[PDB]
Amino acid sequence: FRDTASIGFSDTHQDEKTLRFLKKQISQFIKHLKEYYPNNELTKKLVMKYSDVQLLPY
Amino acid sequence: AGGLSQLVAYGAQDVYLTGNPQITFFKTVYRRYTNFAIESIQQTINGSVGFGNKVSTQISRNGDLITDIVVEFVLTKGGNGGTTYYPAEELLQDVELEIGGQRIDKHYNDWFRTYDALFRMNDDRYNYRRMTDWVNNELVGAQKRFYVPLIFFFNQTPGLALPLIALQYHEVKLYFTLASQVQGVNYNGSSAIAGAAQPTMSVWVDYIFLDTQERTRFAQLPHEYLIEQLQFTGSETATPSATTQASQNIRLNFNHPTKYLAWNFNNPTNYGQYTALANIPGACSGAGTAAATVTTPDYGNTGTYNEQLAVLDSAKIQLNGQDRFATRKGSYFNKVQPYQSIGGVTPAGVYLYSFALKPAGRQPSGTCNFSRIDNATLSLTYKTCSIDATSPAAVLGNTETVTANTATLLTALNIYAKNYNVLRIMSGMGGLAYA
Amino acid sequence: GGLSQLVAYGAQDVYLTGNPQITFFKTVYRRYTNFAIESIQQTINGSVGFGNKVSTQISRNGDLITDIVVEFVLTKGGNGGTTYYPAEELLQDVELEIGGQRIDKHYNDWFRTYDALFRMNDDRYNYRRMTDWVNNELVGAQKRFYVPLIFFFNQTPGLALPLIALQYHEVKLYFTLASQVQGVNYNGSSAIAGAAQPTMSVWVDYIFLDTQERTRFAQLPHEYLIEQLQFTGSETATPSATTQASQNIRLNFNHPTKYLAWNFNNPTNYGQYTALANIPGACSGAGTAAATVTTPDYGNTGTYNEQLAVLDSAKIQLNGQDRFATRKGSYFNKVQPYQSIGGVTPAGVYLYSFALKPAGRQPSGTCNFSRIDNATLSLTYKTCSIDATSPAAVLGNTETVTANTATLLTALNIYAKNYNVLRIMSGMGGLAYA
Amino acid sequence: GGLSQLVAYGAQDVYLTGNPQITFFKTVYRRYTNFAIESIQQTINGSVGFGNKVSTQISRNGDLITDIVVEFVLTKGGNGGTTYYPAEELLQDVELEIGGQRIDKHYNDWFRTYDALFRMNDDRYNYRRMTDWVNNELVGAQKRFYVPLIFFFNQTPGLALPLIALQYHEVKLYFTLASQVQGVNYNGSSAIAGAAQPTMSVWVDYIFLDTQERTRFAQLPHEYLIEQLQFTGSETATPSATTQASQNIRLNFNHPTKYLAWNFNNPTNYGQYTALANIPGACSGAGTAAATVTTPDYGNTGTYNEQLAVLDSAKIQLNGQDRFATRKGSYFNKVQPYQSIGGVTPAGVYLYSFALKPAGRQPSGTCNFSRIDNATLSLTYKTCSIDATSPAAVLGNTETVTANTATLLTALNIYAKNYNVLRIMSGMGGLAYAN
Amino acid sequence: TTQASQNIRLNFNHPTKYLAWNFNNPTNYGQYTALANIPGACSGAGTAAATVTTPDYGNTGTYNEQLAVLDSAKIQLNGQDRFATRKGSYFNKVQPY
């Protein structure tokens, strides 16, 4: 029938977590001073916080 | 002689201006751009329409990208000229932007008024008022079509056009709440206007049609659009009095990198009233004469630059217990901040504090990340409410720290924060990077 | 203080400030070429006077030219309130000729339409101070007006016309002066005895280039992306008090068009795009016993009161297909300018852009009418049912109607602005497309 | 719809969209450095009061400085209409010094001239709100006035003064306060008994930089392209009913100059660049029996009524030769600003640019006076034959004449704005060129 | 004269099953609503002696929502609405239904 291949609930790319995420970033890389670390590693910090999809057979 | 006499007046102090020249002004090369076309297309409105109703629209896939959105309304005057104040703006109580089933943003009629008060200017501001009010001394029964452009990030620059084309499986929806009452249209102060007509509403979306090379890339590639969002909370205003300067610590429940905060004090009774009423020309209904009352504004002249009628004396913002800046007078927030940061003129009762060099632009220019601040607080001090609002000698002839007795009617405080977020779009779906 | 904000940093900031590319606290200024600019008077050929045709040849004093200002000196033939941008009315038209080819042409009405749409704020106010009397001057007052021209090279140095690269070609301006100017030599249809003839002077601002820059312009080929005005006059499907007039005009337009613009007017009175009425400013004497809805308050000819405008709605159809859904006249008057210009357009003047930013120099979307067989502008007019002599009738009325005096707006002026290329090579120039 | 425009592609579209280089529908914003801004109060040395000279050293709290606002608290010594930009009048001048070396200096009249030429629309109005009383305030009224400074680093972040890179040099501002301010402590020549002394405070807006940028600023040498104001006051070859006075003023200017600016004025009436007359707003009591054309309507001192201006025509010569053809004073008042700035200039204020766009910061053509042996401003004045007390004579007259009261405009102020280079090296600095 | 508003940070910990709350008059135990001159809503309600300063203590609690104070409410977690704003009556009648 109707073709809607999404769920439509903003649950894929939303980083809907607390502000414990930057604390996880501090304990995830190294260097508890993240005022100069994201200023240095920009792409290396960007790719560390992205999606992961688990496809369906349909 | 002539221009050549200047041209040859060349020496060492010119070297850093014209030596080893890099540019000229007399050869502009325009950039070749992708082919596209723009069309304004009417959307379907779901839900009953009229005062107090909530309606919504789903933006259809007529084109590839969307930018500017204008809500049209048809309103009829419930009274004579001078009885309305931006009534189409008042009518559109709020607008909520949902993409892919999630809130992206939300605007309020008061925000539209505050936003305009701070960021529009000159003839753009006048043209805007012409689109939301009756400014040619129209009379009761007059009918006009009003236009209320939306102020979401994609409605301000093509640079943030929403790629409906790259949102194949997610819908873009706008939820619009219409006010139950609009001054000078269906209500006059607290009274209803018998026989008032209901508004007609229509929503128009400006679509961009891209050529095939551009359309292909949008449909296929992931995108991350830097967007703006409005955060807003309403607060109780510590009420000032004739006998005291009230003070207040307001907790600011904000998050994300914020360009600026903005706020106003108001009297919810009368839309757009950010100042005290007074018997001085334009400051109250009938102001300047015997019949003047300081219980009702001259609605058509609700806004004013008369600082004396503003309630705020001074303020500071604290972040996690540390003063952000030294306490400054309300007049700093009202005149200096926007002088430096916007370049327009801000009405009395409306305040701005920027964390950015240029808060009026799209390009980030300094932000305050409130997600890293446990306790952001706006600390306010109010003026003494001892001036007899009905007597110009007291109203116009008075001190810095003292305002109208009628300033105690301005009991509501609206605090806004405009911030950044990222709208990530991939494989037909999207949403914001940070909740 | 400020430190408390710097420390407030985390993942949400990375997209804004990580691996920073720019700062705001240090500007690199770009070294530019060496040049100077001089204002030089041109000689006017022919005979200056009302209704006369004159012309001027631009002298080779400098290498490039930009701004052109035409000075006129006029004396008031009546009191304050009797004139409306009279220097604009006087410069009936100006034609730009390069190498004997017609490149462009403006009309007094275009200057008025253009101003109505694209100038604004104090640019517009200062602009009026140069073409009219705005300090309540009285009969006999004499003023020099400065009418800037608005050809592509008169708006930006980026398109300065390289006379240096045009060694073989003359650049000329042909001017038509109006037979009559309101409040100067005529008052409505009446002549004003004793009115003076105009004094005219054309000033061209010429850029002097140093050796390296001058040589490149003189020797290299150039392609200047310029804008041109297209214009045709039409008879208006004259509004009526009994019904809604309608009209469909095939537009004889060409080239990638950034926008269309149009107005309805009473050809009798320069700048009158709206109906006359007995409401303040809408007619001579409006608001009192002496009010006449047959003559405008000339000093207040233009207005933002849309009730007096005549366009109910409009659309543009291309080769039988709608280009957009029909929109109301107030869309074209208030929204288009809001979205595309950022200024405030007077009632009776309409704009429809095909461009994101039509007010600028850089192309931002165009409609190429050179590939459209039937570009038709469809106009629906308001019903002129309002008794203009009764301010209540005007001020309290509905969306679809206007003044009975709106039927006087019998002329229709439709403009289009497009892009073309002015090619310059081996000392000569001309347009790439006709 | 829009699709028919996209599809009908032809030869003339090639020069607009063929081999496209850009789009408009996806803006990538540049990532900027991490910084924050703060307004910090300075301590003023010396006593503030009318006629006093005071100064302050800018505190080393942040790394860079930009905007500076001087706050004043003034009171009204009379009713509305008695003052004219009194906070601007009060701040007689400000001198900027680095390491003991003069960098620049502004004058109250310059602020008025600058405003008259370069601010506009609601920027100009908002500015007026910060320096005057514009809501018909009455005698005894108290207001806080903000006078932003106009030094080169007060206009753009791009020139933020690197206090951080000046480890060995002090930076100071010297402020001269006027002996009298109209409508505050004096009314025309008469002192106002009981007039209050001004309260004054200087606020400097600092930028706090993060680690990497602070390091670079502290350690690297810098060369900041700056603007400077040159100024000399002159006696005016005052015109008369009996003659067209003329004058040749050798211009003692140096450096690459963007523009010259000047005005003629009444030595005792701040901001009066035009003759007084019995026409609305042009004099005290204008329009009635009590009208006098010896005293202005102070609150309405400024005007666009050129009839009351005194310059018939002018030219600038370089090395004794004409630089451009002689033009009418109205050219320098209306056209030059139209072309070079885009705002509206008040009658009596004139501009001549040597630059395409002097209003900006980027050089766009300059006249280097350090290479011009004999630059001269040649003036021709209007004939002062109009009986200023008669509107028939004032409002209906010819191009070459002015008011008999125009002979009161005996002061001539000639300014020049130029470029120089401010070098900061190893913690110290100063300017590259003296002249 | 105005709709009052309030933002209350919730200093809670642990895996909460539910929140519950009430508004009350500290003077009168169990008074969660406004007092009124309608049967059971105040001391003396229905007669000449009625006062709306003191409750009918034996009938202190009521089901008459008109006397309820809360107009609407929402709960946010890290500034994000946990649910769309609902009326006070939603939290009084529907939730427990």
Side-chain angles (χ1 to χ4, degrees), chain A residues 2-8 10 13 15 19 21-25 29 32-34 37-40 43 45 47 50-51 53 55-57, chain B, chain C residues 1-167 169-434, chain D, chain E:
Chain A
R2 181 180 160 275
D3 199 62
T4 287
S6 90
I7 200 150
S10 64
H13 305 263
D15 194 347
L19 259 297
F21 174 60
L22 91 168
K23 187 62 192 164
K24 195 260 180 188
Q25 284 290 289
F29 286 120
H32 311 88
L33 182 59
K34 294 206 313 304
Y37 183 51
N39 292 9
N40 273 358
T43 62
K45 196 147 159 40
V47 307
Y50 280 141
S51 58
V53 187
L55 44 91
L56 301 150
Chain B
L4 292 173
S5 68
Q6 180 183 326
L7 186 63
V8 302
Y10 178 85
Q13 296 182 45
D14 294 299
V15 171
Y16 56 84
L17 299 176
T18 63
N20 298 321
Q22 297 171 293
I23 64 170
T24 186
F25 301 105
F26 303 107
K27 185 176 179 179
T28 296
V29 178
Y30 295 97
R31 294 184 182 274
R32 297 184 300 270
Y33 68 96
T34 56
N35 193 287
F36 68 93
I38 183 165
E39 189 179 356
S40 184
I41 300 172
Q42 191 173 33
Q43 304 297 307
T44 296
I45 300 169
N46 297 313
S48 300
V49 60
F51 287 110
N53 285 298
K54 182 177 182 179
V55 300
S56 67
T57 193
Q58 181 179 341
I59 299 172
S60 67
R61 299 180 192 277
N62 289 112
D64 298 305
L65 315 176
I66 57 171
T67 59
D68 194 277
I69 300 177
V70 178
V71 180
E72 297 184 356
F73 297 98
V74 181
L75 291 83
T76 59
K77 289 181 63 48
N80 290 322
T83 63
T84 60
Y85 189 68
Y86 296 86
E89 193 183 65
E90 185 176 17
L91 176 60
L92 184 55
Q93 180 181 289
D94 60 50
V95 184
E96 180 174 354
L97 174 66
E98 180 180 3
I99 301 177
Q102 78 203 277
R103 183 178 295 154
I104 302 300
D105 204 356
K106 186 172 183 184
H107 293 298
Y108 303 90
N109 57 4
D110 191 73
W111 176 241
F112 280 91
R113 177 64 180 86
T114 298
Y115 174 78
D116 187 71
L118 293 172
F119 295 95
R120 293 200 179 87
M121 60 186 78
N122 305 336
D123 288 350
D124 184 46
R125 178 175 286 167
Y126 178 60
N127 191 59
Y128 176 77
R129 187 174 184 181
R130 292 174 70 208
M131 293 168 68
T132 64
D133 205 351
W134 288 269
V135 297
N136 303 284
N137 298 319
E138 293 88 342
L139 302 173
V140 65
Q143 183 188 52
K144 298 288 184 291
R145 185 175 299 267
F146 295 98
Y147 301 92
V148 182
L150 300 180
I151 56 174
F152 293 108
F153 66 90
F154 64 93
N155 301 137
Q156 298 296 294
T157 179
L160 297 174
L162 294 172
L164 294 176
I165 188 169
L167 293 165
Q168 292 88 317
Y169 306 112
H170 281 184
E171 303 297 327
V172 179
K173 296 180 181 177
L174 298 169
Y175 296 84
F176 307 93
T177 302
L178 304 178
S180 66
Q181 60 181 57
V182 177
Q183 170 64 46
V185 178
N186 65 333
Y187 296 90
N188 188 39
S190 68
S191 296
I193 299 171
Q198 298 301 310
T200 298
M201 182 178 166
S202 177
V203 178
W204 292 81
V205 177
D206 294 352
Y207 289 81
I208 305 299
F209 295 82
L210 301 172
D211 200 352
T212 59
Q213 291 179 4
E214 182 179 3
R215 302 184 63 272
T216 299
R217 288 193 296 274
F218 274 103
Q220 294 175 348
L221 300 176
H223 308 278
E224 290 180 344
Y225 297 88
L226 182 66
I227 65 166
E228 299 184 2
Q229 299 180 293
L230 181 69
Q231 297 173 73
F232 168 72
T233 61
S235 298
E236 184 182 3
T237 300
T239 301
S241 178
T243 61
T244 184
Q245 294 191 258
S247 64
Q248 185 179 10
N249 293 309
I250 301 169
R251 306 303 182 198
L252 304 176
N253 190 18
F254 296 130
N255 285 88
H256 306 293
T258 296
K259 292 171 81 181
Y260 63 90
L261 304 182
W263 63 94
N264 67 56
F265 300 85
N266 65 74
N267 181 346
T269 302
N270 302 308
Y271 178 77
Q273 184 187 338
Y274 302 115
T275 63
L277 302 176
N279 189 18
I280 63 171
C284 70
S285 174
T289 190
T293 178
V294 296
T295 64
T296 301
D298 182 355
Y299 288 106
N301 294 300
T302 298
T304 187
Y305 298 104
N306 188 343
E307 178 181 329
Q308 197 69 43
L309 299 176
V311 76
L312 185 66
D313 189 11
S314 68
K316 65 176 182 175
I317 299 167
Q318 301 177 52
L319 305 176
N320 289 337
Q322 296 185 19
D323 287 345
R324 176 58 179 88
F325 60 93
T327 304
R328 304 296 293 275
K329 304 299 299 194
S331 64
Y332 171 77
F333 301 93
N334 184 244
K335 299 184 180 79
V336 176
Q337 281 278 316
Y339 173 81
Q340 291 175 235
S341 66
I342 299 173
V345 63
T346 300
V350 179
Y351 303 98
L352 172 69
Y353 184 78
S354 177
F355 300 110
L357 296 169
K358 297 181 181 179
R362 297 281 83 78
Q363 169 69 58
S365 58
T367 59
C368 178
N369 186 345
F370 283 103
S371 295
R372 300 286 286 108
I373 302 172
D374 184 1
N375 291 280
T377 299
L378 177 64
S379 295
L380 304 175
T381 301
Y382 299 96
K383 292 183 176 183
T384 301
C385 300
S386 64
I387 292 169
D388 183 349
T390 64
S391 178
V395 175
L396 297 171
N398 218 311
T399 64
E400 181 177 46
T401 60
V402 181
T403 190
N405 65 300
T406 56
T408 62
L409 298 173
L410 299 171
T411 62
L413 166 61
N414 292 337
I415 302 165
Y416 299 96
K418 195 80 189 296
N419 64 278
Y420 290 103
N421 205 323
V422 177
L423 176 59
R424 179 179 297 91
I425 302 174
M426 183 178 79
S427 298
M429 298 168 280
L432 302 180
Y434 301 96
Chain C
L3 182 60
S4 68
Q5 183 182 328
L6 290 174
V7 300
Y9 187 90
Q12 294 188 262
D13 295 293
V14 173
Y15 289 106
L16 298 173
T17 59
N19 297 12
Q21 296 172 296
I22 63 169
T23 187
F24 302 105
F25 302 110
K26 183 70 174 72
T27 296
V28 63
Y29 293 97
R30 293 182 183 174
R31 298 185 300 270
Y32 66 98
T33 61
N34 184 33
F35 67 92
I37 303 175
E38 187 179 0
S39 184
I40 300 173
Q41 190 173 20
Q42 306 301 303
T43 300
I44 298 168
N45 301 323
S47 177
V48 174
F50 288 109
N52 292 324
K53 182 176 288 188
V54 301
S55 67
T56 186
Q57 182 181 351
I58 61 171
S59 295
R60 293 176 64 78
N61 289 104
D63 301 311
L64 312 174
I65 60 171
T66 55
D67 297 355
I68 300 178
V69 178
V70 180
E71 292 179 3
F72 298 100
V73 182
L74 301 173
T75 59
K76 288 181 63 48
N79 290 320
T82 61
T83 61
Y84 188 69
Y85 296 91
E88 299 181 0
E89 185 177 6
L90 179 60
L91 195 159
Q92 180 178 311
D93 61 49
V94 57
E95 180 176 350
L96 175 65
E97 183 182 84
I98 301 176
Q101 185 178 50
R102 182 173 59 249
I103 303 301
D104 204 355
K105 185 171 183 177
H106 302 297
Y107 300 87
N108 58 6
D109 192 72
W110 177 239
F111 281 94
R112 184 64 301 269
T113 298
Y114 176 81
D115 188 58
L117 294 173
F118 295 95
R119 294 197 181 85
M120 61 184 77
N121 304 332
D122 289 343
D123 184 67
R124 175 176 286 173
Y125 179 69
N126 191 62
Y127 176 90
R128 186 173 186 180
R129 292 175 70 208
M130 292 188 288
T131 63
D132 206 352
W133 287 266
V134 296
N135 292 280
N136 197 28
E137 293 89 341
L138 302 173
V139 65
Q142 183 184 49
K143 302 291 176 194
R144 184 177 299 268
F145 295 122
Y146 300 92
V147 180
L149 302 183
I150 56 172
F151 291 113
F152 66 88
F153 63 91
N154 299 137
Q155 295 186 40
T156 181
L159 299 174
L161 186 68
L163 294 176
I164 189 66
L166 297 169
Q167 184 67 52
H169 285 168
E170 299 292 354
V171 178
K172 296 188 178 184
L173 304 172
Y174 294 86
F175 295 91
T176 301
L177 303 179
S179 64
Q180 62 184 58
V181 178
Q182 171 65 44
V184 178
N185 65 332
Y186 293 90
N187 188 25
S189 68
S190 296
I192 300 171
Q197 292 294 313
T199 298
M200 183 181 168
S201 179
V202 179
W203 292 90
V204 178
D205 293 349
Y206 297 85
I207 303 103
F208 294 82
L209 302 174
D210 201 333
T211 299
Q212 291 179 355
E213 181 180 1
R214 184 174 183 269
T215 300
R216 287 194 297 272
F217 279 104
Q219 295 180 333
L220 299 177
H222 306 277
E223 294 186 357
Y224 295 92
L225 179 62
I226 63 167
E227 58 181 63
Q228 297 176 292
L229 184 70
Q230 298 176 63
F231 170 71
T232 62
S234 297
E235 188 180 16
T236 300
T238 301
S240 174
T242 62
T243 190
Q244 294 190 260
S246 65
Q247 188 167 21
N248 297 286
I249 301 168
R250 185 181 181 201
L251 305 173
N252 298 337
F253 294 150
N254 284 280
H255 305 285
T257 297
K258 60 164 87 188
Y259 65 85
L260 303 182
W262 63 95
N263 67 65
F264 301 93
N265 66 77
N266 181 339
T268 303
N269 300 313
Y270 176 74
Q272 184 183 342
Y273 302 121
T274 62
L276 300 172
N278 192 14
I279 63 171
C283 69
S284 174
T288 190
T292 170
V293 299
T294 63
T295 300
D297 182 356
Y298 286 104
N300 294 298
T301 298
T303 186
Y304 295 89
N305 187 334
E306 70 182 285
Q307 192 71 60
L308 300 176
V310 298
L311 184 65
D312 187 10
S313 70
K315 65 176 181 178
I316 301 169
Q317 185 178 80
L318 307 175
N319 299 325
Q321 296 294 309
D322 290 333
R323 174 58 180 74
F324 62 95
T326 304
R327 304 296 293 275
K328 304 298 292 186
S330 65
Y331 170 78
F332 294 100
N333 186 248
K334 295 178 180 178
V335 176
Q336 282 277 316
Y338 171 82
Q339 292 175 322
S340 65
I341 299 173
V344 64
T345 300
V349 178
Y350 303 101
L351 171 69
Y352 184 79
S353 177
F354 302 107
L356 295 170
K357 299 292 181 184
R361 297 282 85 81
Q362 170 70 58
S364 57
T366 61
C367 178
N368 184 8
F369 288 116
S370 295
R371 295 290 178 270
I372 300 167
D373 190 52
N374 304 286
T376 299
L377 178 64
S378 296
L379 303 171
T380 300
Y381 296 80
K382 293 184 177 182
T383 299
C384 300
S385 67
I386 296 170
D387 183 343
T389 64
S390 177
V394 176
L395 293 171
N397 227 299
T398 64
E399 181 177 50
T400 58
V401 298
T402 190
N404 64 300
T405 57
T407 65
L408 297 172
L409 301 174
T410 62
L412 167 60
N413 292 348
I414 302 166
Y415 300 92
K417 186 175 282 286
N418 65 282
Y419 289 97
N420 203 327
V421 178
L422 178 60
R423 296 184 294 182
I424 302 175
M425 61 187 76
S426 299
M428 292 177 72
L431 297 172
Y433 299 87
Chain D
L3 293 172
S4 293
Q5 186 178 324
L6 299 177
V7 174
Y9 179 87
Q12 293 180 267
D13 292 301
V14 172
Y15 57 81
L16 299 175
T17 64
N19 297 321
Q21 297 172 294
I22 62 169
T23 187
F24 301 108
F25 305 107
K26 183 174 178 179
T27 297
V28 178
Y29 293 93
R30 293 178 294 174
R31 298 187 304 275
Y32 67 98
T33 62
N34 183 32
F35 68 91
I37 59 173
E38 187 182 359
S39 184
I40 299 173
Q41 191 171 27
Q42 306 298 306
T43 301
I44 299 168
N45 291 313
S47 296
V48 303
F50 285 102
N52 291 322
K53 182 179 184 180
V54 300
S55 67
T56 191
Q57 183 174 318
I58 299 171
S59 176
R60 301 296 191 85
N61 290 113
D63 300 292
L64 311 173
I65 60 171
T66 56
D67 294 342
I68 299 177
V69 180
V70 179
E71 294 184 0
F72 296 98
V73 181
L74 311 176
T75 61
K76 295 187 78 62
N79 290 320
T82 62
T83 60
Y84 188 70
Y85 294 83
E88 193 180 61
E89 184 177 18
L90 179 60
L91 185 57
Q92 181 178 311
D93 61 48
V94 185
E95 180 173 355
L96 174 67
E97 184 181 76
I98 300 175
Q101 185 175 118
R102 178 179 294 163
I103 304 301
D104 204 355
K105 185 172 183 178
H106 295 291
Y107 300 86
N108 58 3
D109 190 72
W110 176 242
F111 279 92
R112 177 64 180 86
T113 298
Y114 176 79
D115 187 65
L117 294 174
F118 295 96
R119 294 197 182 87
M120 61 185 77
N121 305 335
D122 290 345
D123 180 38
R124 176 174 286 168
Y125 178 65
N126 191 62
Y127 176 78
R128 183 177 180 178
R129 292 175 71 207
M130 294 168 70
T131 62
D132 206 350
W133 286 268
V134 297
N135 292 279
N136 298 319
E137 294 89 338
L138 302 173
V139 65
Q142 184 182 52
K143 178 173 171 181
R144 185 174 298 267
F145 300 91
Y146 299 93
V147 181
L149 301 181
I150 56 173
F151 290 108
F152 73 89
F153 59 85
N154 297 136
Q155 298 296 294
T156 180
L159 298 176
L161 188 69
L163 293 175
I164 188 170
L166 293 167
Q167 292 88 321
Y168 296 101
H169 283 182
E170 74 281 16
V171 179
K172 293 179 177 172
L173 298 171
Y174 295 83
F175 304 86
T176 301
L177 304 176
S179 64
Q180 62 183 61
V181 177
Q182 170 64 42
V184 178
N185 65 331
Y186 293 92
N187 187 26
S189 68
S190 296
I192 299 171
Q197 297 299 306
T199 297
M200 178 180 170
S201 178
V202 178
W203 292 83
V204 177
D205 296 353
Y206 291 82
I207 301 104
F208 290 80
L209 302 172
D210 200 335
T211 298
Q212 291 183 322
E213 193 172 9
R214 291 177 80 204
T215 299
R216 288 193 297 273
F217 275 105
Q219 295 178 338
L220 298 176
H222 306 278
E223 291 185 349
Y224 296 89
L225 181 65
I226 65 167
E227 299 183 3
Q228 296 179 297
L229 182 69
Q230 298 175 68
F231 169 71
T232 301
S234 297
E235 184 178 4
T236 300
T238 302
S240 175
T242 61
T243 184
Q244 293 182 302
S246 67
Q247 190 170 14
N248 298 290
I249 302 170
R250 184 300 181 180
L251 300 176
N252 193 24
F253 296 126
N254 288 285
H255 305 294
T257 297
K258 290 194 286 180
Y259 65 91
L260 304 181
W262 64 96
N263 67 65
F264 300 90
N265 67 76
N266 186 314
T268 62
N269 297 328
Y270 179 77
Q272 183 182 343
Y273 302 94
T274 62
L276 302 176
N278 190 16
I279 63 171
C283 69
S284 175
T288 190
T292 177
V293 296
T294 62
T295 300
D297 182 355
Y298 284 104
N300 293 301
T301 298
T303 187
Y304 299 105
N305 189 338
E306 181 60 2
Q307 194 73 59
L308 300 176
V310 297
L311 181 63
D312 188 39
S313 69
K315 65 180 183 180
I316 300 166
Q317 297 188 311
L318 305 179
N319 297 338
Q321 297 294 309
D322 294 352
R323 172 57 182 88
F324 62 93
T326 305
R327 305 296 293 276
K328 301 297 296 189
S330 66
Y331 171 77
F332 294 98
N333 181 251
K334 296 177 183 177
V335 176
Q336 283 279 308
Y338 177 79
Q339 291 175 288
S340 65
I341 299 173
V344 62
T345 300
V349 178
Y350 304 99
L351 171 68
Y352 182 77
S353 177
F354 300 108
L356 290 165
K357 298 293 180 182
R361 300 284 82 77
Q362 168 68 58
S364 59
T366 60
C367 181
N368 185 350
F369 281 76
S370 295
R371 300 287 292 164
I372 302 169
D373 295 346
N374 293 277
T376 300
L377 177 65
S378 294
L379 305 173
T380 301
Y381 295 81
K382 292 185 176 182
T383 299
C384 300
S385 63
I386 294 171
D387 183 343
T389 64
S390 178
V394 176
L395 297 172
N397 226 301
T398 63
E399 183 177 49
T400 59
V401 297
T402 191
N404 64 299
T405 57
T407 64
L408 298 174
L409 304 179
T410 64
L412 167 61
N413 292 335
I414 302 166
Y415 300 93
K417 198 80 190 290
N418 64 277
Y419 287 105
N420 205 323
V421 178
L422 175 62
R423 176 176 287 174
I424 303 98
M425 60 187 175
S426 299
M428 63 175 284
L431 299 175
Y433 301 96
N435 56 63
Chain E
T1 61
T2 64
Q3 291 184 300
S5 64
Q6 187 174 16
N7 293 280
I8 302 171
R9 184 183 290 273
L10 302 178
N11 297 326
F12 293 130
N13 302 314
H14 302 295
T16 298
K17 183 190 183 69
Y18 65 86
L19 302 181
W21 63 95
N22 64 56
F23 299 86
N24 64 79
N25 182 336
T27 300
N28 301 316
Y29 178 77
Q31 183 185 338
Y32 301 113
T33 65
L35 302 178
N37 189 15
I38 63 171
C42 69
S43 174
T47 190
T51 178
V52 296
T53 64
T54 301
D56 181 356
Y57 287 106
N59 294 295
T60 299
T62 187
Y63 291 87
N64 188 331
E65 180 61 4
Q66 195 71 56
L67 300 175
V69 74
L70 186 66
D71 183 47
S72 69
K74 65 179 184 178
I75 299 165
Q76 298 184 313
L77 305 177
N78 194 29
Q80 311 304 301
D81 292 356
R82 173 58 183 75
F83 56 89
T85 304
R86 304 295 292 276
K87 305 301 295 188
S89 65
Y90 175 91
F91 295 100
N92 181 245
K93 297 183 178 77
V94 177
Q95 280 277 314
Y97 174 80

